[model samples]
Target: QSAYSRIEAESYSNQSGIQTETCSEGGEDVGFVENGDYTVYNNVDFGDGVGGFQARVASATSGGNIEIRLDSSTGTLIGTCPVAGTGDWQTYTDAKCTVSGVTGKHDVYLVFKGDSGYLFNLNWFTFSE
Candidate 1:
Protein backbone atom coordinates (compact mmCIF):
# COMPACT_ATOMS: atom_id res chain seq x y z
CA GLN A 1 0.00 0.00 0.00
CA SER A 2 1.10 3.58 -0.66
CA ALA A 3 0.76 6.73 1.41
CA TYR A 4 -1.15 9.95 0.69
CA SER A 5 0.68 11.87 -2.07
CA ARG A 6 0.13 15.52 -2.95
CA ILE A 7 1.12 18.18 -5.50
CA GLU A 8 0.79 21.92 -4.96
CA ALA A 9 0.77 24.60 -7.69
CA GLU A 10 0.29 28.35 -8.07
CA SER A 11 -0.29 30.45 -11.23
CA TYR A 12 1.44 33.32 -13.02
CA SER A 13 -0.71 35.46 -15.34
CA ASN A 14 -0.50 36.08 -19.11
CA GLN A 15 0.38 39.61 -20.08
CA SER A 16 2.47 38.46 -23.04
CA GLY A 17 -0.71 37.58 -24.99
CA ILE A 18 0.34 33.95 -24.82
CA GLN A 19 -3.20 32.69 -24.22
CA THR A 20 -2.54 32.55 -20.42
CA GLU A 21 -2.64 28.80 -19.91
CA THR A 22 -2.18 26.69 -16.75
CA CYS A 23 -4.94 26.80 -14.11
CA SER A 24 -3.94 27.55 -10.50
CA GLU A 25 -5.39 28.08 -7.01
CA GLY A 26 -6.62 31.64 -6.63
CA GLY A 27 -6.73 33.69 -9.82
CA GLU A 28 -3.58 35.36 -11.11
CA ASP A 29 -2.30 37.92 -8.67
CA VAL A 30 -4.88 36.77 -6.09
CA GLY A 31 -7.74 38.21 -8.11
CA PHE A 32 -10.92 36.55 -9.36
CA VAL A 33 -10.10 33.33 -11.31
CA GLU A 34 -11.38 35.04 -14.42
CA ASN A 35 -14.73 33.61 -15.49
CA GLY A 36 -14.10 31.22 -18.39
CA ASP A 37 -12.72 27.83 -19.42
CA TYR A 38 -9.23 27.13 -18.08
CA THR A 39 -7.07 24.02 -17.78
CA VAL A 40 -4.94 22.92 -14.84
CA TYR A 41 -1.47 24.44 -15.23
CA ASN A 42 0.20 21.04 -15.39
CA ASN A 43 -1.59 17.79 -16.21
CA VAL A 44 -1.38 15.30 -13.30
CA ASP A 45 -1.87 12.05 -15.19
CA PHE A 46 -3.06 9.27 -12.91
CA GLY A 47 -2.34 6.27 -15.13
CA ASP A 48 -4.10 2.95 -14.37
CA GLY A 49 -5.24 2.46 -10.81
CA VAL A 50 -7.36 0.19 -8.63
CA GLY A 51 -8.02 2.63 -5.82
CA GLY A 52 -9.40 5.45 -8.03
CA PHE A 53 -8.46 9.12 -7.59
CA GLN A 54 -9.05 11.72 -4.88
CA ALA A 55 -8.83 15.52 -4.88
CA ARG A 56 -9.85 18.86 -3.30
CA VAL A 57 -9.40 22.39 -4.72
CA ALA A 58 -9.34 25.30 -2.26
CA SER A 59 -11.51 28.16 -3.42
CA ALA A 60 -10.14 31.43 -2.08
CA THR A 61 -12.84 33.52 -3.66
CA SER A 62 -16.39 33.48 -2.39
CA GLY A 63 -19.30 32.61 -4.74
CA GLY A 64 -16.85 31.16 -7.25
CA ASN A 65 -18.60 28.25 -8.92
CA ILE A 66 -15.93 25.90 -10.28
CA GLU A 67 -16.55 22.67 -12.16
CA ILE A 68 -13.92 19.93 -12.05
CA ARG A 69 -14.25 17.53 -14.95
CA LEU A 70 -12.57 14.39 -16.26
CA ASP A 71 -12.05 14.29 -20.02
CA SER A 72 -10.52 12.25 -22.83
CA SER A 73 -8.16 13.27 -25.60
CA THR A 74 -11.17 13.18 -27.88
CA GLY A 75 -12.87 15.80 -25.71
CA THR A 76 -15.37 13.45 -24.10
CA LEU A 77 -16.28 14.17 -20.49
CA ILE A 78 -15.79 11.10 -18.33
CA GLY A 79 -17.02 12.88 -15.20
CA THR A 80 -17.70 16.29 -13.73
CA CYS A 81 -17.87 17.93 -10.30
CA PRO A 82 -21.12 16.54 -8.87
CA VAL A 83 -21.68 19.62 -6.71
CA ALA A 84 -19.87 22.83 -7.60
CA GLY A 85 -18.67 25.77 -5.49
CA THR A 86 -16.33 25.65 -2.47
CA GLY A 87 -19.01 27.66 -0.56
CA ASP A 88 -15.93 29.38 0.92
CA TRP A 89 -12.78 27.35 1.71
CA GLN A 90 -13.81 23.96 3.03
CA THR A 91 -12.57 20.47 2.19
CA TYR A 92 -14.46 19.59 -1.09
CA THR A 93 -14.08 15.84 -1.34
CA ASP A 94 -17.65 14.57 -1.63
CA ALA A 95 -16.76 11.23 -3.36
CA LYS A 96 -19.81 11.79 -5.53
CA CYS A 97 -18.33 11.55 -9.06
CA THR A 98 -18.00 8.30 -11.03
CA VAL A 99 -14.65 6.49 -10.78
CA SER A 100 -14.91 3.47 -13.08
CA GLY A 101 -13.10 3.34 -16.45
CA VAL A 102 -11.46 6.69 -15.86
CA THR A 103 -8.35 7.08 -18.03
CA GLY A 104 -5.93 9.38 -19.82
CA LYS A 105 -4.38 12.54 -18.37
CA HIS A 106 -7.61 13.89 -16.92
CA ASP A 107 -7.99 17.58 -17.58
CA VAL A 108 -8.61 19.20 -14.18
CA TYR A 109 -10.52 22.42 -14.78
CA LEU A 110 -12.04 25.48 -13.12
CA VAL A 111 -14.92 27.40 -14.66
CA PHE A 112 -16.29 30.44 -12.89
CA LYS A 113 -20.03 29.74 -13.36
CA GLY A 114 -21.67 32.37 -11.18
CA ASP A 115 -21.67 36.13 -11.71
CA SER A 116 -21.25 36.98 -8.05
CA GLY A 117 -17.60 37.61 -8.99
CA TYR A 118 -15.43 34.52 -9.45
CA LEU A 119 -12.30 33.97 -7.37
CA PHE A 120 -10.67 30.78 -6.13
CA ASN A 121 -7.71 29.94 -3.93
CA LEU A 122 -7.57 27.21 -6.61
CA ASN A 123 -5.13 24.96 -4.82
CA TRP A 124 -4.73 21.39 -3.57
CA PHE A 125 -5.07 18.35 -5.91
CA THR A 126 -3.92 14.94 -4.65
CA PHE A 127 -4.26 11.47 -6.25
CA SER A 128 -3.34 7.88 -5.45
CA GLU A 129 -3.73 4.38 -6.93
Candidate 2:
Protein backbone atom coordinates (compact mmCIF):
# COMPACT_ATOMS: atom_id res chain seq x y z
CA GLN A 1 0.00 0.00 0.00
CA SER A 2 1.16 3.52 -0.78
CA ALA A 3 1.92 5.64 2.25
CA TYR A 4 -0.74 8.34 2.61
CA SER A 5 0.83 11.74 2.84
CA ARG A 6 -0.85 13.93 5.38
CA ILE A 7 -1.61 17.35 3.99
CA GLU A 8 -2.37 20.71 5.55
CA ALA A 9 -6.14 21.00 5.83
CA GLU A 10 -7.67 24.14 4.42
CA SER A 11 -11.21 25.42 4.77
CA TYR A 12 -13.44 26.99 2.12
CA SER A 13 -17.01 28.23 1.77
CA ASN A 14 -18.99 27.22 -1.29
CA GLN A 15 -22.41 28.32 -2.48
CA SER A 16 -23.64 27.61 -6.04
CA GLY A 17 -20.11 28.14 -7.47
CA ILE A 18 -18.35 30.98 -5.66
CA GLN A 19 -15.20 30.31 -3.64
CA THR A 20 -12.56 32.28 -1.69
CA GLU A 21 -9.99 31.75 1.02
CA THR A 22 -6.59 32.92 2.31
CA CYS A 23 -5.23 31.61 -1.00
CA SER A 24 -7.73 32.89 -3.66
CA GLU A 25 -11.10 32.29 -5.27
CA GLY A 26 -13.32 33.09 -8.27
CA GLY A 27 -16.69 34.96 -8.01
CA GLU A 28 -18.84 33.73 -10.92
CA ASP A 29 -18.96 30.15 -9.73
CA VAL A 30 -20.46 30.81 -6.27
CA GLY A 31 -22.74 33.78 -6.91
CA PHE A 32 -25.94 34.34 -8.88
CA VAL A 33 -27.93 37.57 -8.79
CA GLU A 34 -31.14 35.96 -9.93
CA ASN A 35 -34.22 35.87 -7.71
CA GLY A 36 -32.23 37.88 -5.27
CA ASP A 37 -29.31 35.48 -5.34
CA TYR A 38 -26.14 37.49 -5.27
CA THR A 39 -22.51 36.75 -4.57
CA VAL A 40 -21.26 37.85 -1.18
CA TYR A 41 -17.74 37.69 0.26
CA ASN A 42 -17.10 37.59 3.97
CA ASN A 43 -13.79 37.93 5.84
CA VAL A 44 -12.08 39.57 2.84
CA ASP A 45 -9.37 41.70 4.43
CA PHE A 46 -8.62 45.11 2.97
CA GLY A 47 -6.50 48.07 4.08
CA ASP A 48 -5.07 46.08 6.92
CA GLY A 49 -8.66 45.78 8.17
CA VAL A 50 -8.86 49.49 8.78
CA GLY A 51 -9.57 51.90 5.90
CA GLY A 52 -10.90 49.30 3.40
CA PHE A 53 -10.02 47.15 0.43
CA GLN A 54 -10.25 47.30 -3.38
CA ALA A 55 -10.98 44.57 -5.92
CA ARG A 56 -10.98 44.57 -9.70
CA VAL A 57 -14.00 42.58 -10.79
CA ALA A 58 -14.19 41.04 -14.26
CA SER A 59 -17.67 40.52 -15.71
CA ALA A 60 -18.42 37.95 -18.41
CA THR A 61 -21.97 37.70 -19.68
CA SER A 62 -22.93 36.22 -23.04
CA GLY A 63 -25.57 38.44 -24.71
CA GLY A 64 -26.52 39.45 -21.19
CA ASN A 65 -25.24 42.59 -19.48
CA ILE A 66 -23.77 42.72 -15.98
CA GLU A 67 -23.12 45.17 -13.20
CA ILE A 68 -20.92 45.26 -10.10
CA ARG A 69 -22.26 46.83 -6.97
CA LEU A 70 -20.96 47.46 -3.44
CA ASP A 71 -23.39 47.13 -0.59
CA SER A 72 -23.55 46.85 3.17
CA SER A 73 -24.81 44.06 5.36
CA THR A 74 -28.21 45.72 5.64
CA GLY A 75 -28.45 45.74 1.83
CA THR A 76 -27.54 49.35 1.38
CA LEU A 77 -25.97 50.51 -1.85
CA ILE A 78 -22.45 51.81 -1.37
CA GLY A 79 -21.35 51.93 -5.00
CA THR A 80 -22.36 50.46 -8.33
CA CYS A 81 -21.22 50.17 -11.96
CA PRO A 82 -22.32 48.13 -14.95
CA VAL A 83 -19.36 45.93 -15.67
CA ALA A 84 -18.54 47.52 -19.06
CA GLY A 85 -19.53 45.64 -22.18
CA THR A 86 -16.62 43.60 -23.44
CA GLY A 87 -19.26 41.49 -25.27
CA ASP A 88 -17.29 38.43 -24.22
CA TRP A 89 -14.80 37.61 -21.49
CA GLN A 90 -15.90 40.62 -19.43
CA THR A 91 -12.46 41.43 -18.12
CA TYR A 92 -14.13 44.28 -16.23
CA THR A 93 -11.02 44.91 -14.23
CA ASP A 94 -9.98 47.81 -12.01
CA ALA A 95 -13.27 47.78 -10.10
CA LYS A 96 -11.77 49.15 -6.93
CA CYS A 97 -13.79 50.11 -3.82
CA THR A 98 -13.49 50.94 -0.13
CA VAL A 99 -15.19 48.53 2.21
CA SER A 100 -16.97 49.58 5.40
CA GLY A 101 -15.87 46.91 7.87
CA VAL A 102 -12.84 44.91 6.83
CA THR A 103 -12.39 42.78 9.86
CA GLY A 104 -12.85 39.09 10.57
CA LYS A 105 -16.14 39.11 8.64
CA HIS A 106 -17.72 41.60 6.23
CA ASP A 107 -20.49 41.38 3.65
CA VAL A 108 -19.95 42.36 0.01
CA TYR A 109 -22.12 41.43 -2.93
CA LEU A 110 -22.15 41.32 -6.76
CA VAL A 111 -25.48 41.85 -8.47
CA PHE A 112 -25.62 40.43 -12.00
CA LYS A 113 -29.00 41.40 -13.37
CA GLY A 114 -29.17 40.83 -17.09
CA ASP A 115 -30.62 38.62 -19.80
CA SER A 116 -31.23 34.90 -19.23
CA GLY A 117 -28.09 33.59 -20.91
CA TYR A 118 -26.01 36.12 -19.04
CA LEU A 119 -22.91 34.55 -17.55
CA PHE A 120 -20.27 36.35 -15.48
CA ASN A 121 -17.01 34.61 -14.83
CA LEU A 122 -15.07 36.09 -11.92
CA ASN A 123 -11.42 35.50 -12.59
CA TRP A 124 -10.12 36.64 -9.20
CA PHE A 125 -11.05 38.83 -6.22
CA THR A 126 -8.04 40.12 -4.36
CA PHE A 127 -6.98 42.89 -1.99
CA SER A 128 -4.71 45.67 -3.20
CA GLU A 129 -2.13 47.74 -1.39
Candidate 3:
Protein backbone atom coordinates (compact mmCIF):
# COMPACT_ATOMS: atom_id res chain seq x y z
CA GLN A 1 0.00 0.00 0.00
CA SER A 2 1.00 3.62 -0.52
CA ALA A 3 0.08 7.01 0.89
CA TYR A 4 -0.48 10.29 -0.88
CA SER A 5 -1.55 13.91 -0.46
CA ARG A 6 -3.69 16.46 -2.29
CA ILE A 7 -3.38 20.24 -2.41
CA GLU A 8 -6.27 22.44 -3.46
CA ALA A 9 -5.38 24.73 -6.31
CA GLU A 10 -7.13 27.68 -4.75
CA SER A 11 -5.18 27.09 -1.59
CA TYR A 12 -1.96 28.25 -3.09
CA SER A 13 0.36 29.92 -0.59
CA ASN A 14 1.67 32.43 -3.12
CA GLN A 15 0.31 33.31 -6.51
CA SER A 16 0.10 36.02 -9.12
CA GLY A 17 -2.38 36.92 -11.86
CA ILE A 18 -4.75 34.03 -11.14
CA GLN A 19 -8.15 33.68 -9.56
CA THR A 20 -10.46 30.98 -8.22
CA GLU A 21 -13.84 29.89 -9.54
CA THR A 22 -16.39 27.14 -8.97
CA CYS A 23 -15.35 24.00 -10.70
CA SER A 24 -17.55 21.68 -12.72
CA GLU A 25 -16.00 18.94 -10.57
CA GLY A 26 -17.78 20.18 -7.43
CA GLY A 27 -15.10 22.44 -5.95
CA GLU A 28 -13.19 25.63 -6.55
CA ASP A 29 -10.42 25.71 -9.12
CA VAL A 30 -7.69 28.25 -9.77
CA GLY A 31 -8.64 30.22 -12.87
CA PHE A 32 -8.22 33.62 -14.53
CA VAL A 33 -4.85 32.54 -15.86
CA GLU A 34 -4.43 35.32 -18.37
CA ASN A 35 -0.92 36.48 -17.47
CA GLY A 36 0.01 34.83 -14.23
CA ASP A 37 1.58 31.90 -12.47
CA TYR A 38 0.96 29.89 -9.29
CA THR A 39 3.04 28.58 -6.46
CA VAL A 40 2.13 26.29 -3.63
CA TYR A 41 5.06 27.98 -1.85
CA ASN A 42 5.18 25.57 1.07
CA ASN A 43 3.08 23.02 3.01
CA VAL A 44 4.02 19.81 1.17
CA ASP A 45 6.42 17.26 2.46
CA PHE A 46 7.44 14.60 -0.03
CA GLY A 47 9.37 12.76 2.69
CA ASP A 48 11.57 10.04 1.23
CA GLY A 49 10.39 10.03 -2.35
CA VAL A 50 7.83 11.20 -4.82
CA GLY A 51 6.61 9.33 -7.84
CA GLY A 52 4.32 11.54 -9.89
CA PHE A 53 1.88 14.46 -9.89
CA GLN A 54 -1.79 14.34 -10.85
CA ALA A 55 -3.86 17.43 -11.50
CA ARG A 56 -7.54 17.95 -12.23
CA VAL A 57 -7.62 20.72 -14.79
CA ALA A 58 -9.91 22.48 -17.26
CA SER A 59 -8.87 24.47 -20.30
CA ALA A 60 -10.95 25.88 -23.08
CA THR A 61 -8.12 28.00 -24.41
CA SER A 62 -4.71 26.94 -25.62
CA GLY A 63 -2.81 24.51 -23.42
CA GLY A 64 0.43 25.01 -21.55
CA ASN A 65 3.05 23.26 -19.45
CA ILE A 66 2.91 22.83 -15.70
CA GLU A 67 6.49 23.04 -14.52
CA ILE A 68 6.87 21.43 -11.13
CA ARG A 69 9.56 23.17 -9.10
CA LEU A 70 11.04 22.43 -5.74
CA ASP A 71 11.85 24.80 -2.82
CA SER A 72 11.46 28.22 -4.41
CA SER A 73 10.01 30.01 -7.41
CA THR A 74 13.27 29.53 -9.30
CA GLY A 75 13.91 26.13 -7.78
CA THR A 76 14.98 22.96 -9.49
CA LEU A 77 12.68 21.56 -12.16
CA ILE A 78 11.55 18.12 -11.18
CA GLY A 79 8.70 17.54 -13.61
CA THR A 80 6.67 19.10 -16.39
CA CYS A 81 3.12 18.15 -17.33
CA PRO A 82 1.16 19.36 -20.30
CA VAL A 83 -2.46 20.49 -20.12
CA ALA A 84 -4.73 20.20 -23.16
CA GLY A 85 -7.74 22.19 -24.35
CA THR A 86 -11.02 20.59 -23.32
CA GLY A 87 -13.40 22.49 -25.65
CA ASP A 88 -14.88 24.40 -22.72
CA TRP A 89 -13.61 26.17 -19.63
CA GLN A 90 -15.77 24.09 -17.34
CA THR A 91 -14.76 20.80 -18.87
CA TYR A 92 -12.22 18.99 -16.70
CA THR A 93 -9.31 16.70 -17.44
CA ASP A 94 -6.59 14.93 -15.49
CA ALA A 95 -2.96 15.59 -16.25
CA LYS A 96 -0.02 13.59 -14.89
CA CYS A 97 3.72 14.08 -14.80
CA THR A 98 6.49 11.91 -13.38
CA VAL A 99 9.07 13.36 -10.99
CA SER A 100 12.43 12.40 -9.55
CA GLY A 101 15.06 13.59 -7.03
CA VAL A 102 12.39 15.08 -4.81
CA THR A 103 12.70 14.39 -1.11
CA GLY A 104 12.36 15.85 2.39
CA LYS A 105 10.12 18.84 3.10
CA HIS A 106 9.85 21.38 0.31
CA ASP A 107 7.53 23.85 -1.32
CA VAL A 108 6.27 22.98 -4.79
CA TYR A 109 5.39 25.38 -7.56
CA LEU A 110 2.96 24.74 -10.42
CA VAL A 111 4.25 27.31 -12.86
CA PHE A 112 1.63 27.81 -15.57
CA LYS A 113 2.94 28.97 -18.93
CA GLY A 114 1.02 29.26 -22.19
CA ASP A 115 -0.55 31.52 -24.77
CA SER A 116 -2.22 34.84 -24.05
CA GLY A 117 -5.57 35.08 -22.26
CA TYR A 118 -7.30 32.39 -20.24
CA LEU A 119 -4.79 29.61 -20.17
CA PHE A 120 -6.35 26.97 -17.95
CA ASN A 121 -7.99 26.07 -14.66
CA LEU A 122 -6.63 23.84 -11.90
CA ASN A 123 -8.94 22.14 -9.44
CA TRP A 124 -6.45 20.27 -7.32
CA PHE A 125 -3.18 18.41 -7.41
CA THR A 126 -1.86 15.24 -5.82
CA PHE A 127 1.50 13.72 -5.05
CA SER A 128 1.95 9.96 -4.81
CA GLU A 129 4.85 8.04 -3.39
| TM-scores for candidates 1 onward, in order | 0.46, 0.43, 0.90
Which residue runs does candidate 3 get wrong by more than 4 Å? 1-3
**In model 3, which range of ten residues has the least summed lDDT?**
1-10
The sequence of per-residue lDDT tens digits that candidate 2 reaches over residues 25-123 is 333322232323346554333333343223334445442322333343236554443344444343445444543433333344554455564344444
Model 1 clash pairs? Answer: 22-41, 23-41, 25-121, 25-122, 26-120, 26-121, 26-122, 60-120, 60-121
**Model 1 residue 102 lDDT score:** 48
In candidate 2, position 63 carries an lDDT of 23
> Which ranges in model 2 have alpha carbons more than 4 Å from their true place?
1-35, 46-74, 90-105, 126-129
lDDT of each: 0.40, 0.37, 0.79
- Candidate ranking under TM-score, highest first, comes to 3, 1, 2
Tens digit per residue, CA lDDT, model 3, 42-128: 757777768888988888887787888877766799888888898888898898888886667777878887777778888988877
Error of 2 at 22 (Å): 20
Deviation from truth (RMSD, Å), model 3 = 2.5
Runs of candidate 1 with Cα error greater than 4 angstroms are 1-5, 11-31, 41-43, 50-65, 69-74, 82-96, 105-112
Q: Kindly provide the TM-score of model 2 when superposed on the true structure, using C-alpha atoms.
A: 0.43
lDDT of model 2 at position 15: 28
Candidate 2's error at 19, in angstroms?
9.5
Displacement of residue 79 (Cα, Å) in model 3 is: 0.5
